[PDB]
Design a protein around this ligand. Structure first.
Ligand SMILES: C=CC1=C(C)c2cc3[nH]c(cc4nc(cc5[nH]c(cc1n2)c(C)c5C=C)C(C)=C4CCC(=O)O)c(CCC(=O)O)c3C
Ligand SMILES: C=CC1=C(C)c2cc3[nH]c(cc4nc(cc5[nH]c(cc1n2)c(C)c5C=C)C(C)=C4CCC(=O)O)c(CCC(=O)O)c3C
Ligand SMILES: C=CC1=C(C)c2cc3[nH]c(cc4nc(cc5[nH]c(cc1n2)c(C)c5C=C)C(C)=C4CCC(=O)O)c(CCC(=O)O)c3C
Lengths: 174, 174, 174, 174, 174, 174
């Protein structure tokens, strides 16, 4: 019995350790996506950059859960990281559609972990979770939605030009 | 046939893609190691820091291979990342002994990829590899060896004090 | 027998003097290309600029081989410079397609000279060559490939607009 | 019929395109001369420098004619560049004697093109030519003459010492 | 078996330890040469300075081999340093002729050690060697050759004046 | 008879030339010592640094005797430099014990040369010697003695820890 731990349920840490593997594996899809747009036959650098910073952000979410878990008297247990679920990612459109989903998946996770953190009454969890995680997750998921409208409204006329303009003026304007 | 690729063998990229998975999985052991020393019952922060920067360095080596591979006309293929090969890591001594090895393993890899890069005559590979990889690898592997002498010469008297002094004055002196 | 020369084969310099004429004549195509886009009936200034700096870069590669050759005890022998192999260069697309090739041609040259520099064992050559030449050549040949994807994805819808946007936002964004 | 061209005779551009090839080929002799004094058995660096900047100046004259020609509605046509007319260049004296001549040759050209530009009444030509070209050409041809007096007055006593002093104190005094 | 060493052949270090003694003994000739021109009956300070900095440069090459050798798991073994092979060094001409040779001798050494470093397949050696050693060695050996042309072209008229001018204006002009 | 020399005995210079070889060979032991503590199985960097600066200091003493000797009308004659008298140097304790001695040996030399410089009446010698040499020699020999007390008082309990603390806090405190 680690002289620190208090109010930390064993399921609350089992959930934190799956969260850790979720962030690490979403971080994996993001670099998988990134180098796919650096490819010389896709050549869409604005997009690589979008995804390479996302990958970082996710590794950050991971490191932060690891740190809070050690701070509560948890035992960070690691599992292996499932490889990305597709290799060629298509259009920006399609890449972006895979993305907004990986993000409903992780927000959903936060949502379920936050709940177990309350029905199994857990005060500073039902705050550590929302302040960094729940919140950024909503901002990120709106801005991902706005991107889709935009690339859809563009890439639906003559599509190749839509992709270009979008990466040239969206990641170089706002 | 990607209009870019020239002098890049298919085995040279298969090797680069295993190198990518080697760097990613060594990056995995390093964060596994790091959070283990942030544990409140190990409490050796100097060591967490050592390993958390190493983990980064390795993710860097990875990103750099991914980037050169896309630059040669390669197809970065990803595999899943094997989980760390141990969970509790012991003493700094033992953690450090696991480390100098993960590093002979990756240097050995560089060594074999560099060789296939020449017996299958490959000019800017038999330079991209040494300038970042081969070289840092030697500096890193000496400094890891010097650490062992030091922690061995300390942690062999009354061991607990050796661990402390070493993390307090080595990661806070040189 | 020039009191300097050491380990420098006569074929290694014959190759360096063809390399010199290759760089000088690729430098020639680049200015030929450049003034063609300054033409008032092509009017695509972003492109002239692309090619006028390339022409310089190549004259640089040339001067540098001349200098290393005098540094090894070689006798720089000059030949005349073959005029560009086409006069009107078309579309940016077509101009760009002529380009990525002049560049596989010179990289191939570096590749063959580097090899003769080793099968005829030649240590500081099998380094002078890669550090400036082999390496820049790969970076240049990727970025030329990325350009093609981009102008192809644009100039394939209504083509005239593709050309315009590409020169306006690519050479004025990244 | 290019919607720009006005008062530009076809012979005025044929002359401008030979002028272009004259500047390019004089630029060729100058680098041929330059690397000859970087040779370790001539070793006269002050002189290499003299000629390497001259070579640039000439490439400049060339680029400028190309640019004015595109500005008048001309079609810049390129020809190949005749290799330098000698390989070993001797003494500074002799190198310098080859030089003052390549310069009467190009000034003579300016002189004949300027004339056709008037007997075939051509107003902004019979100014573009003198402002950059005719004028610099006189200053350059005096200073080349002054150099000859000087190296002749020196290199006529015990000659080797004359060469040395001249390159040491002339290109390092005025 | 030193826990560090990897891919380092025993002959590769035996060669590195002779290299160490070569650099140390060339460093010895250079100070032997230096104080000979500080002599009040030679009095040629520009030359002492030339050689005293060369001596340093060589001690540097030595220290650097010692450091890389300890970095590979080698055992730096020292031998005694053979005294300079002449005591009075003559003219600058003669001093300089002894020099360009001590330098073909060490470049030749680099050349042979680099080769054993490859026929006995050794990746980060066949780079540590060229980046500092092989390369500087060529630049140094050209500039030494240029000096000879110069002092020969001077010291061949009335010789005493040639020596003076050369040390006064070469080591005080470029 | 060198027109400079005055009051300089031939034995005074024979002594200065042995002094030169003493400084050069003590400079040799110091680098021999230095790289021994850079070894990855000794790993005591504070000590390498101690000895590498000592080695320099000694080369300085040497260069200074060479310079005064040329200043008096002496003929600096060189001899070869005897290799260090031991290869593995042990403990800091033992390394340090070899050191304080190489220093009584050179101070003793200064002492005997200073004496011959007076019984063979020699005014500016019986000052050049004490101002740089005799004096620094006493300061150096006290501080070497203080080090011994300290490492002895430490390395006599559990010895490995004594070595560590001493190099960590002595070369990083005062
Ligand atoms: C293969 C799946 C993974 C992906 C795609 C991934 C992606 C990243 N990991 C990063 C940083 C990092 N990743 C890190 C440990 C790991 N990262 C790992 C796996 C992944 N990490 C593994 C395995 C690790 C252990 C679990 C660490 C420690 C950092 C650096 C943190 C720091 O200190 O800056 C960055 C930041 C790059 C930059 O320069 O902006 C990315 C994009
Ligand atoms: C072989 C005959 C040639 C010689 C000797 C020559 C010499 C030169 N060309 C230069 C620059 C240049 N030369 C250039 C295009 C060419 N240059 C070429 C042929 C020659 N160019 C060819 C062939 C080209 C096309 C006609 C360009 C574009 C520049 C650079 C202009 C700029 O943008 O700075 C420079 C400037 C070097 C410096 O660093 O100061 C020299 C000396
Ligand atoms: C093998 C025995 C020797 C040892 C161990 C030695 C050690 C040294 N010699 C140095 C500098 C130097 N050593 C020098 C000439 C010699 N040095 C030589 C032999 C030795 N020199 C020989 C042989 C030389 C001629 C007698 C010179 C000229 C310098 C540099 C002086 C300057 O101009 O800075 C330095 C300074 C290193 C630094 O970066 O702080 C050390 C440690």
């Amino acid at each position: 019995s680690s002289q620190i731990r208090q109010n930390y349920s064993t399921e609350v840490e089992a959930a934190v350790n799956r969260l850790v593997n979720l962030y690490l594996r979403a971080s994996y899809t993001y670099l998988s996506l990134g180098f796919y747009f650096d490819r010389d036959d896709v050549a869409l650098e604005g997009v690589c950059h979008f995804f390479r910073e996302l990958a970082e952000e996710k590794r950050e979410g991971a490191e932060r859960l690891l740190k809070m878990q050690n701070q509560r008297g948890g035992r960070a247990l690691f599992q292996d990281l499932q490889k990305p679920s597709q290799d060629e990612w298509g259009t920006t459109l399609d890449a972006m559609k895979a993305a907004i989903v990986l993000e409903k998946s992780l927000n959903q996770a936060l949502l379920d972990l936050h709940a177990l953190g309350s029905a199994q009454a857990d005060p500073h969890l039902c705050d550590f979770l929302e302040s960094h995680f729940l919140d950024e997750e909503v901002k990120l998921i709106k801005k991902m939605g706005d991107h889709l409208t935009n690339i859809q409204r563009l890439v639906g006329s003559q599509a190749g030009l839509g992709e270009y303009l979008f990466e040239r003026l969206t990641l170089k304007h706002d």
